[PDB]
Amino acid sequence: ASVVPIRMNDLNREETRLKTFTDWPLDWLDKRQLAQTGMYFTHAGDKVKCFFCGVEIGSWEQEDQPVPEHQRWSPNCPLLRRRTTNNVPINAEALDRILPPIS
Ligand SMILES: [Zn+2]
């Protein structure tokens, strides 16, 4: 993935993030786990935007993955970085699993 340089929506909620994803073009890139890893769909092309670090990201290659992309381009992301956020995750255990360790 390349990066795009620099109701009411509670886009801190994963459910709602997930809402944004109903006109989402890329059927092989799993919007669910995109929307769980911080991102909401801007609607423009294939470009998503992270609520927590403001990273933007489009041009998804057919073997890319959501977290590693998210990490590559903005690795100091509060959410990825397992800082305190206001994220409200559908399934807290699901989030934990799919976030970079720190073993
Ligand atoms: Zn982020």
Residue type, 65: Q
Distances (CA, A) of 101 to 16, 31, 94, 97: 26, 22, 13, 8
CA–CA distance, 54 with 79 (Å, rounded to integer): 11
Angstrom resolution of this structure: 2.4
CA–CA distance, 76 with 74 (Å, rounded to integer): 6
The CATH number for 1-103, chosen from 3.40.30.10, 3.20.20.80, 1.10.1170.10, 1.20.1290.10, is: 1.10.1170.10
Q: Within its chain, how far is the Cα of 57 from the centroid?
A: 9
Structure tokens at 1: 């993935």
Q: Which of 98, 94, 3 is nearest to 57 (CA)?
A: 3
C-alpha R_g of the chain: 13
Structure tokens at 64: 């890319």
Burial label, 49 (beta-carbon count in 10 A; 0-12, 13-18, 19+): buried
Distance 39 CA to ligand 1 centre (A): 7
Please tell me the number of Cα atoms within 13 Å of 14 on its side-chain side. Answer: 18
Distance 78 CA to ligand 1 centre (A): 7
Residue type, 17: R
